[PDB]
Ligand SMILES: C=C(C)CCOP(=O)(O)OP(=O)(O)O
Ligand SMILES: C=C(C)CCOP(=O)(O)OP(=O)(O)O
Ligand code: F3S
């Protein structure tokens with residue numbers, strides 16, 4: 001059985017930074033360190049940190065005075081940010097700079113009373129955080145997940161409209177939504193294409209090259225990881241059997257039974273060690289040496305705030 | 310999805326009085342009406358009165374001469390009260406009678422020059438006002454929040470020592486703190502149990518009953534409401550997901566997704582209209598008719614001063 005590895009895969013620059021922020025805060029201030037929501041959507045990373053002293057809460061209300069609070073990589077709304085600022089807490093923002101960039105644009109439209117449309121999945125924290133950047137009652141902030149939502153969307157002034165997108169969306173599906181937006185609101189304004197980050201675009205490009213060669217595709221990532229799910233679905237879209245797994249323990253013999261080529265990749269929030277163990281399980285299941293596919297080079301690094309180095 | 314309502318919940322006698330005090334003053338003297346600190350810790354109540362011309366400030370130096378000033382339900386230190394008195398201002402005290410009660414005991418201890426220990430949360434206005442009732446240099450006024458604080462405390466004369474508590478604390482945590490105080494300072498004197506008021510005691514008792522029946526608990530109250538937070542904590546500590554929300558808009562679908570029983574209560578400063586809207590939201594989210602639980606009856610009512618009747 002041939003084992004192929006997608007390239008790129010795993011840790012993006014935003015995730016690397018976020019983790020380092022929690023780890024450093026713990027080293028600098030000792031336990032406990034409070035984090036609002038899983039720092040990144042990976043159970044191994046979250047469990048690991050929890051074991052080191054990180055305490056993941058749901059509401060800032062649960063955080064004691066004098067404590068250190070960290071915002072997760074997915075970002076937070078202005079209400080959450082203001083609530084933290086009014087509390088006696090030391091706060092560190094692990095929001096990925098690429099999400100913050102979308103935030104600023106939403107805040108802008110808001111200060112211009114112009115309505116904005118967000119392409120994203122309802123319920124996801126990044127969506128709450130981003131839509132949470134809109135305040136102006138005179139304008140409007142709307143969410144659309146598909147062309148249908150677009151077909152039914154009703155706004156106040158389609159002459160002054162703009163759109164933005166979640167950063168971990170499917171490049172292809174997002175393209176369809178955009179097309180619908182432009183046909184329905186010919187005066188709508190947005191980025192040159194979308195707000196999908198380099199990491200997501202690259203990992204999707206990479207999984208596509210992987211699948212056209214592997215019969216089975218294993219995507220290391222947690223169920224609540226948007227970008228990870230995207231990877232698995234794209235693979236399944238191309239006719240390949242794809243599986244979203246948190247670690248080696250999830251692999252089922254039946255899955256790679258008689259498979260001559262299995263592909264492995266990882267979401268932007270999954271550590272490489274998890275992949276390493278996946279290859280090990282696959283090899284103790286028949287697989288041969290792991291062969292990394294040639295891929296797009298990534299050179300972006302986001303440094304931790306000076307205070308936490 | 311079954312919708313359960315804690316009993317009792319919402320408005321306590323103190324909150325109901327403080328609000329009526331600001332409303333009545335506005336109706337008698339018209340706007341503006343200055344209020345030191347949020348009358349009660351609820352943004353809906355505050356934003357509303359602010360819309361009606363009540364100006365909430367934090368320092369007396371923010372109030373104009375000849376203006377009407379109202380002290381919040383949480384109370385004020387003697388320093389603030391004196392500063393107000395030294396100024397050309399008309400003052401109406403909305404301090405909860407139950408808070409004033411604790412004030413009097415701290416004042417008593419101060420006169421005797423005997424040291425007092427307050428169990429409370431640093432920074433809260435009630436704590437600031439109560440600590441502010443002690444002014445005798447020869448004595449002492451100390452604050453402790455947990456047994457850990459008690460373990461570090463050293464006093465001048467532990468033979469003459471008394472303690473008091475904030476009125477909105479967790480009954481259970483406060484009990485543990487008391488236990489520590491009596492073991493470290495065996496001759497300390499205090500109330501029979503604590504200064505936690507009936508409303509705080511009943512609401513905690515009520516949310517406990519609610520929690521052992523609902524999977525998820527929604528506590529209607531603002532972030533800065535001490536008693537509201539205790540309600541959420543209690544439920545959380547019983548293994549239930551609990552959220553502190555200001556109104557229906559804060560409710561996230563994932564919280565109640567596939568939840569067969571959700572419980573809702575409200576802090577002492579949250580208007581029922583807010584609960585009604587939360588129920589409405591939960592219902593359009595799959596919930597049915599709201600079921601009120603059986604609960605201890607509350608019959609306390611604090612009247613507004615005669616000078617403000619309408
Ligand atoms: C902060 C961003 C952009 C997401 C990083 O990956 P995660 O797995 O942690 O979270 P999602 O893909 O679900 O956005
Ligand atoms: C004046 C008292 C006793 C508190 C009333 O409730 P609030 O919500 O207004 O304020 P806290 O619980 O934070 O004390
Ligand atoms: S927005 Fe940021 S956190 Fe990771 S995948 Fe894209 S980099």
Ligand code: F3S
Pocket residue numbers: 321322323324382405406407408476477506507508509536577
């Ligand atoms: S002390 Fe007073 S204002 Fe409310 S919670 Fe208790 S009554």
